[PDB]
Design a protein around this ligand. Structure first.
Ligand SMILES: CCS(=O)(=O)N1CCC(C(=O)O)CC1
Length: 93
């Protein structure tokens, strides 16, 4: 049975006007800006951008990859696919 999301979990993350995007739940570093309540810091692979999202927009990677894990034309998407599959826990700073 599922637990709540935790730092290191891999997902496709959905934001308005974008295809479901490979991403991970990030840690918050000491001294770093915390997300609003009920929100998680989401690091998007490929673009290397962060946004704050709630669970409604977070699709666990293993379950969803056969649907969402396909090449897309959008900038940084295919880079993103490589990273989630090949080094999802690396530093991309
Ligand atoms: C979600 C795909 S993305 O990595 O291109 N990026 C789009 C702009 C987003 C924002 O509006 O905050 C951050 C995420």
């Amino acid at each position: 049975m599922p637990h709540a999301f935790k730092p290191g979990d891999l997902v496709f993350a959905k934001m308005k006007g974008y295809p479901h995007w490979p991403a991970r739940i990030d840690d918050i570093a000491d001294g770093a800006v915390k997300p609003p309540p009920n929100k998680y810091p989401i690091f998007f692979f490929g673009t290397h951008e962060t946004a704050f999202l709630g669970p409604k927009d977070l699709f666990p990677y293993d379950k969803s990859k056969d649907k969402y894990g396909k090449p897309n034309k959008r900038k940084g998407f295919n880079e993103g696919l490589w990273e989630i599959q090949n080094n999802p826990h690396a530093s991309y700073s």
